[PDB]
Structure 1
């Protein structure tokens, strides 16, 4: 067909984000692993008052990773500002290695935060109300992504950062896609198998419902205070068979029955059966009201 919905992520990079490399001062390395490394930095000229502020810069080492950073930057540029997404401040794409500048989140990733706070569980401590809040905020951020026809494809506790105010922000949009034109997205690198829906493993298809499956696994990490999914189970032929057979993880220790009910429905083999992020948001909001 000669008519198509236009994908903003495919459009050329908008230079409104362009930031001079000279105005950045790199500090210590905040993280490594999946996509390059993130370094804390000081940026000047971002404020209307010309003050300097602390920012996080994502970069790669010196070619799928090169495009994934550019893809993440464009997805963020299209998404816009949201409370529950890591916010894009600027980018450096001229005269050097590509740099993506985002807001700095003090607490770091949610997975490491829940492990650090596991012993303390139940003023700086963690309790069940924090876990419900985390569930709700991430659901809100996800429901926002869906409203923009966007799929994260890598939702997990490691990809949620905690900022001041006990606010959670989703990050790491390198695998994220916009599926407006087609209802299903088909991929042809390394993937987070423990977080993937079955149709995504077996048939390589990603949808809004595959993002919901990943959300359910996230809830399992959340209410087990940062435990690894499918504990002690390597990714092998036995694991794939059990998932196809319908074997799911059991309820984490701290999770309320109602929250486990949501995990189960996120894990339904049939994508149509799974709830939407809009419905999850509603469900969690009613559960919080009962307190």
Structure 2
């Protein structure tokens, strides 16, 4: 195959040194690599990046899927609260996608690694008392993710797999949405074959996407409500002890997950709003952004000069 070159994203292959792989999907791999001269004004600067590449036995459809994925990153643009494409190596070698690197991984495991004592399933020797996330930290993380979906929906992007696994934590803890812009065909995804083998986020989807496969930004709002539930369960598994088979009748009967122990009532009503049965009455991400900013301003207990 051949790929037309784009001078704006094309980076020399020899300036990138691959390192230890970070995570492997069903078809593609991501590695932590070092890119030299990402800043055109600073050709000698080394940047830690995440490089995605196909497998050795990858098929042509996966190649087209990665081409579409890089193109979607290019059209959506740049935003702090999403993973941002930095460039691509398309000529004279395997297709490499150079994007930003998150040192602290996805927010589910990051939150799970910060659970306070008495809440742990097992003892964590890596517990640091100086990094414990206050309520302000959870509300700020939620605000950052909501800002990310506002940017995506502003670009007409439906994540379709919004999850705590699907947002990364930078070294600066700054939330960055991952796995967005995936034009993944909804042809046939089984409800009964776990992820990395093709399970839909059935515990993350809204009923319209669950039954009629209606994926929308309101489904995105529902999944972000699931994110809030997980965050205030500290990366908790949605619907604990609920089988996938019973999820259909539970959501159809209007059942919703309970109040997290350390979660306030206002945020709880926000979760109720995100989980409204009717998508049209579900709140839009801009209003979630403003409400979360207000909760942040109230929680941060810092004076600010109302101009």
User: Conserved in 2, the CA contact under 8 Å of 1:152 and 1:176?
Assistant: no
In structure 2, what is the Cα distance between the partners aligned to 1:69 and 1:199? 28
Distance 1:60 1:253, change over 3 A: farther
Aligned-partner Cα distance in 2 for 1:245–1:14? 52
Gaps of 5+ in 2: 120-128, 190-197, 300-307
Decide which moves more: 32-41 or 106-115: 32-41
TM superposition score normalised by structure 2: 0.82
Is the 1:151–1:176 contact (alpha carbons within 8 Å) kept by the matching residues of 2? no
Say if 2:66 is the partner of 1:72.
no
Please give the secondary structure, in 1, of the residue aligned with 2:180.
Answer: coil
Work out the CA distance in 1 between the residues paired with 2:88 and 2:16: 11
Match of 1:268 among 271, 276, 289: 276
**Structure 1 residue aligned with 2:152, among 145, 159, 163?**
145
Superposed CA deviations along residues 71-123 of structure 1, whole A, max 9, x for unmatched, are: 22112111111111111111122333322111112111111100110036893
Local SS of the residue matching 2:219: helix
Secondary structure in structure 1 of the residue aligned to 2:203: helix
Residue aligned with 1:118, SS: coil
TM-score (norm 1): 0.86
- Identify the residue that residue 25 of structure 1 maps to in structure 2: 17
| Contact 1:154/1:176 (<8 A) preserved | no
Q: Which residue of 1 aligns with 2:170?
A: 163
Bigger mean CA deviation after superposition, 51-60 or 275-284: 51-60
1:166 Cα offset (Å): 2.6
Equivalent in 214, 220, 227 of residue 223 of structure 2 = 214
| Counterpart among 29, 33, 38 of residue 37 in structure 1 | 29
SS of the aligned residue for 1:108 comes to coil
Indicate the SS of the match to 2:146. helix
Deviations 1:17-73 (A, max 9, x none): 122323221111112245622111111231222122221111232255433322221
Distance across 2 between alignment mates of 1:152 and 1:196: 11
CA deviation digits over 1:197-256, x for unaligned, max 9?
1111211121111111111101111010111111122322x2211112211111112211
* Match 1:46 to one of 4, 21, 38: 38
Q: Deviation per CA, 1:157-216: give whole Å up to 9, x if none.
A: 011111133311111125358xxxxxxxx9324322111111112111211111111111
State the match for 1:131 in structure 2.
138
Are the equivalent residues in 1 in contact too, given 2:5–2:91 (CA < 8 A)? no
Count how many residue pairs are aligned between Structure 1 and Structure 2. Answer: 271
Contact preservation (8 Å) 2:116, 2:132: no
Unpaired segments ≥5 residues, structure 1: 1-11, 178-185
Aligned to 2:256: 248
Structure 2 CA distance for aligned equivalents of residues 234 and 101 of structure 1: 38
1:289 paired residue number: 297
RMSD: 2.1
Look up the match of 1:112.
109
